[PDB]
Amino acid sequence: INAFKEAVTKIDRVEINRRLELAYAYNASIAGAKYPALKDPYSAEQVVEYARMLEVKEQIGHVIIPRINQDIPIYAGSAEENLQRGVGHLEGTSLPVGGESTHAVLTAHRGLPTAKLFTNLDKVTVGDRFYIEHIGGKIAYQVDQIKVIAPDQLEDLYVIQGEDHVTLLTCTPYMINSHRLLVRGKRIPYVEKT
């Protein structure tokens, strides 16, 4: 929410860059494999510390989607704790700080009575934009692909070398959840202007 934007301003640029660098290294690591053992976010299988460097007052950034007027905190891992309050990052996929050979997967709950979250993620079209905001600032994506897969298929979630992507992942059809609707953005130039 607001505790992020503010809490961020209070941190020193050097500290920030130290922390971003640690994330880039993580990402470069993931990019390098071979394929990470990826695991259905929608199950208990046991706090998470992989993304400590990005963590600022519990979150690691914010996901903005103008088309559906959503601005949702992001939390590391996909524990139900976090899916109750916002989007959860899927451990094994790139940290959502961007860079070539990264593919971050962000996942969210549809239909919750508390928050809407990715409830209206079906209204998102190719062409649309969303933004990840993190300790580093705000980066921009343009939806380049929307795809419906079976729950045990994952090829679509891996890093694509030389490419910079973020996928918003939810369940589908609405209220049947036999499948997974993936909305994947592709990094585009964005000059944050006051």
Author numbering: 6 to 39, 44 to 55, 60 to 207
Lines from the paper:
Anchoring of these surface proteins to the cell wall peptidoglycan requires transpeptidase enzymes called sortases, a product of an srt (surface protein sorting) gene. The membrane-associated sortase recognizes the LPXTG motif of the substrate protein, cleaves between the Thr and Gly, and forms an acyl-enzyme intermediate. According to the current model of sortase-mediated pilus assembly, the pilus polymerization catalyzed by a pilus-specific sortase is followed by cell wall anchoring of pilus polymers by the housekeeping sortase. To understand the molecular basis of pilin sorting and pilus anchoring within a bacterial strain, we investigated the housekeeping sortase, GBSSrtA, and a pilus-specific sortase, GBSSrtC1, from the PI-1 pathogenicity island of S. agalactiae SAG 2603 V/R. Either GBSSrtC1 or GBSSrtC2 of this GBS strain is capable of polymerizing GBS80, the pilus shaft of the GBS PI-1 pili.
The two molecules of the dimer, related by a non-crystallographic 2-fold axis, in the asymmetric unit of both the type II and III crystals of the GBSSrtC1 display the typical sortase fold made of an eight-stranded beta-barrel. The barrel core is flanked by two long N-terminal helices (H1 and H2), positioned approximately at 75° to each other and away from the dimer interface, which is formed by β6 strands and β4/β5 loops. Subtle differences, such as one single-turn α-helix in the β1/β2 loop present only in chain B of both dimers, and a four-turn and two-turn H1 helix in the type III and II structures, respectively, may explain the plasticity in the sortase structural features, the presence of multimers in the asymmetric unit and the observed multiple crystal-packing arrangements. Residues 44–55 and 44–54 in type II (A and B chains, respectively) and 44–51 and 46–53 in type III (chain A and B, respectively), which cover the putative active site from one-end to the other, form the lid region in GBSSrtC1. Analogous to the Asp58, Pro59 and Trp60 residues of the conserved DP(W/F/Y) motif in SPNSrtC1, Asp49, Pro50 and Tyr51 of GBSSrtC1 anchored the lid in its active site. In addition, the preceding leucine residue (Leu47) was observed inserted into a highly hydrophobic pocket in the active site present below the lid. Cys184 in the GBSSrtC1 monomers displayed a single conformation with its sulfhydryl pointing toward Arg193, which adopted a similar conformation in all of the monomers due to salt-bridge interactions with Asp49 of the lid DP(W/F/Y) motif. Arg193 also formed a weak hydrogen bond with the backbone carbonyl of Asn190, except in the type II chain A structure. Based on its lowest overall B value within the hexamer, ordered catalytic residues and positive density for all residues, we selected molecule X2 of GBSSrtA for comparison with the type II chain A molecule of GBSSrtC1.
